[PDB]
């Protein structure tokens, strides 16, 4: 209970300044996609678009009318439709968009529109600060290939929250979902690297489940072990 709707796109509050935006697409069943909205000082930061441009425009309208702070940047966590399907709506609103350089390189073949800006990463997985200017509380981390080769993750400074995207499944999941683009061999390690990158996080947000505990990370690596 307690999950606010606006148009067709649930917002749920996670922390006083972190909302979960949820949109739905129908996979002829229906499927939820989760993303984040972050209030940091006098601007708004977004993580992940919705499945489509119209849903993404709704997210923007909402920010305008529930937060009323202008959207500074948006970060998308890889080149899949649940994360990137709404790029045009972001660009029409003139919002600076960032993704892993690799996500941007793969976006055309994945049917997605590229972000305007490319994030690069060090060998230890942390984002190069100068490719991510003014991200504020957003801490961007590339844990290695897993769900896709380009998947990145984001921690929120000043919260128990880290966002795993489609990389992490929930603690009671019966599978790792879509392994279509998966790196089987490195998945377990990547799931574990995300865990270790945000060691103090206890609320883990993922793409198709309510926020879960760290058991989500542990369980996902367990399942991925059985792959390799
Ligand atoms: C394209 C979408 O249907 C798909 C995706 O974004 O990869 C959803 N993600 C998962 C998952 O395995 O997280 C399932 S369905
Ligand atoms: Cl499941
Ligand atoms: Cl942490």
């Amino acid at each position: 209970t307690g999950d606010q709707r606006f148009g067709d796109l649930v917002f749920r509050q996670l922390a006083p300044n972190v909302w979960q935006h949820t949109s739905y697409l129908d996979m002829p069943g229906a499927v939820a996609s989760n993303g984040l909205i972050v209030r940091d000082g006098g601007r708004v930061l977004v993580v992940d678009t919705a499945w489509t441009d119209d849903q993404t425009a709704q997210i923007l309208n909402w920010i305008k009318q529930e937060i009323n702070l202008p959207v500074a940047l948006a970060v998308v966590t890889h080149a899949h439709q649940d994360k990137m399907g709404g790029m045009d709506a972001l660009h029409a609103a003139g919002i600076a968009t960032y993704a892993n350089a690799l996500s941007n390189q793969l976006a055309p073949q994945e049917g997605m529109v590229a972000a305007q800006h490319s994030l690069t990463f060090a060998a230890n997985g942390w984002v190069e600060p100068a490719t991510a200017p003014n991200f504020g509380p957003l801490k961007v981390f590339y844990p290695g290939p897993g769900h896709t080769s380009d998947n990145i993750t984001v921690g929120i400074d000043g919260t128990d929250i880290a966002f795993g995207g489609c990389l992490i499944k929930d603690s009671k999941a019966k599978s790792l979902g879509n392994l279509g683009d998966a790196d089987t061999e490195h998945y377990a390690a990547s799931a574990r690297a995300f865990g270790a990158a945000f060691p103090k996080a206890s609320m883990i947000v993922m793409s198709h489940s309510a926020p879960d505990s760290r058991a989500a990370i542990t369980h996902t690596a367990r399942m991925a072990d059985k792959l390799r």
Side-chain angles (χ1 to χ4, degrees), residues 131-164:
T131 68
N134 322 288
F135 273 41
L138 286 195
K139 298 299 196 216
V140 182
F141 178 80
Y142 172 64
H147 179 71
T148 51
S149 62
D150 61 319
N151 57 209
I152 58 177
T153 64
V154 183
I156 308 193
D157 218 66
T159 61
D160 272 281
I161 305 170
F163 181 75

Side-chain angles (χ1 to χ4, degrees), residues 39-215:
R39 179 190 231 143
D40 166 53
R43 74 234 243 265
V44 175
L45 321 175
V46 174
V47 170
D48 291 330
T49 77
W51 300 90
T52 58
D53 297 327
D54 203 19
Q55 295 160 339
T56 306
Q58 284 177 67
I59 295 168
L60 297 183
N61 290 336
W62 207 332
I63 292 171
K64 196 121 47 208
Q65 281 142 71
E66 259 265 6
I67 298 169
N68 214 187
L69 300 175
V71 187
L73 64 89
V75 184
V76 296
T77 62
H78 62 288
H80 269 167
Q81 198 203 339
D82 45 339
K83 311 287 121 188
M84 212 145 183
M87 303 302 301
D88 285 335
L90 290 184
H91 298 167
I95 304 174
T97 63
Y98 292 79
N100 189 353
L102 180 53
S103 301
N104 286 339
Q105 190 174 5
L106 292 165
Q109 40 186 309
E110 299 285 345
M112 303 294 123
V113 180
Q116 265 148 356
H117 305 302
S118 285
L119 306 178
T120 64
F121 302 83
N124 67 8
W126 289 108
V127 61
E128 297 287 347
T131 68
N134 322 288
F135 273 41
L138 286 195
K139 298 299 196 216
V140 182
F141 178 80
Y142 172 64
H147 179 71
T148 51
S149 62
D150 61 319
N151 57 209
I152 58 177
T153 64
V154 183
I156 308 193
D157 218 66
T159 61
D160 272 281
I161 305 170
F163 181 75
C166 312
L167 180 68
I168 312 298
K169 262 52 209 182
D170 73 74
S171 54
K172 297 183 292 298
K174 298 266 196 183
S175 70
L176 293 145
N178 192 357
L179 301 178
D181 294 350
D183 189 323
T184 33
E185 144 143 16
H186 301 118
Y187 200 134
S190 304
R192 293 188 175 111
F194 155 77
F198 311 101
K200 276 185 280 184
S202 57
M203 179 187 300
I204 309 306
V205 185
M206 49 222 51
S207 291
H208 325 287
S209 307
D212 194 348
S213 70
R214 295 190 65 100

